[PDB]
From Swiss-Prot:
GO molecular function: aspartic-type endopeptidase activity
Gene: EAPA
UniProt entry tagged with the keyword Signal: yes
Keyword Transmembrane helix: no
GO terms, biological process: proteolysis
Stated name of the protein: Endothiapepsin
UniProt KW keywords: Aspartyl protease, Disulfide bond, Hydrolase, Protease, Signal, Zymogen
Active site: D35, S199
Enzyme Commission number(s) from the entry: 3.4.23.22
Catalytic activity: Hydrolysis of proteins with specificity similar to that of pepsin A, prefers hydrophobic residues at P1 and P1', but does not cleave 14-Ala-|-Leu-15 in the B chain of insulin or Z-Glu-Tyr. Clots milk
Family affiliation: Belongs to the peptidase A1 family.
Superkingdom classification of source: Eukaryota
Span of the entire protein shown here: 90 to 419 of 419
S-S bonds: C255-C290
Domain Peptidase A1: 17-328
Annotated source species: Cryphonectria parasitica
Amino acid sequence: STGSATTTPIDSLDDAYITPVQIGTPAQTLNLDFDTGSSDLWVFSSETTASEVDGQTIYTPSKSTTAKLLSGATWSISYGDGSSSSGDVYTDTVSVGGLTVTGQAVESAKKVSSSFTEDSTIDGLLGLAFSTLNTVSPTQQKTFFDNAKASLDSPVFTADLGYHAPGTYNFGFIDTTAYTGSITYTAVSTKQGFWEWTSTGYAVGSGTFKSTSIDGIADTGTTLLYLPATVVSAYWAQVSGAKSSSSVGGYVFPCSATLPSFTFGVGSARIVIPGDYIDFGPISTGSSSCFGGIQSSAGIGINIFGDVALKAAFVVFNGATTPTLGFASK
C-alpha cells in the first residue's frame, strides 16, 4: 500500500504545516502537525477542557463506530518549547492520504497548554519519530508509520515541505519526479528515539565549505534550524546589524537586510537553504527587527534540522531494518 497527502503551512511564515487525517467511522477529518521529533498521535477532542479549545476541530470518539477505549491508558507529553498536553487513549481507524491503519492509538487530550489553545489551525500532532518515545502508559503504543510499515510497498515515508506553499507527505514510495539529482543517504542513530544523523559541515552564502561533524535530528515539528553557537555566529556575522537579543530570545536582524544562503552537508552532497527561507519576519507587528530562522542550539542539548532546513530538500525517512535518512535537492 501507499498514501499521499498534501501538507500546508498554517500561516504566512511557515510556522508549522498541517496535513488532513481521517479518524474514525464515519471519518472525522482533523488537521494534524506531522512531527518527526515525537511519537504520539494526539488530538483535540470532545474530552478536552472546554476553556482550552478555541477554534480547533475536535475528535468525538462516541460518534465513531470503530473507536474503542484503551482501558487504563493515559498519556502526557512536554515539548521543547515548554508546551504540553495529556489525556486518555482510544484505538480507532486512521487514514492518511489513502493509507489506512486499523487499531491506531489515538490519544485524546483532556488538557492542553496555552500555546496549543492559541493555535486554532492545529488540531493535534501525528508523531513520526521512533515508537520508543511514545508516552502512553502503562502500555506504550506504536506510531502510525510503525503500524503501517509492514503493509507499505517500501518501509519509508518522505517529507517534501514547501516554502510559503503546500507540499507533500508520501508513505510507502519515493516520488522520483519530486527532486533533482540523486538522493544522498546517511546513517541514523535511533538511540535517543529520533531520526538522528550527522551533517558533514556547512557554508555561509558563497563562502568556503567548513568540514565539521554536526549531530542533529531531522524534525518536521520544529520550525527553525538550531545549530551550534559557533556555526550560528558565523552565519549572522555576514548580516549587517544582526545580533543575538536576550530579550527577544535569539538572533534578530534588520528587516531591510538581504540574507545569505546557508548550505549543509549530507555526506559528500550539499543542500542549499536560500536566504529568504531564513526570514521569519518582524519580531512584533510593525517592527523593523526581524527574527532569524537559524538559531543556537545551546541549552536545547541537541541540534535540530527543523523546517527551515528540511523544506530546502526532499527528505526520505527510511524505516528499513537499519533506518537511514535521505536528502535530495529540489
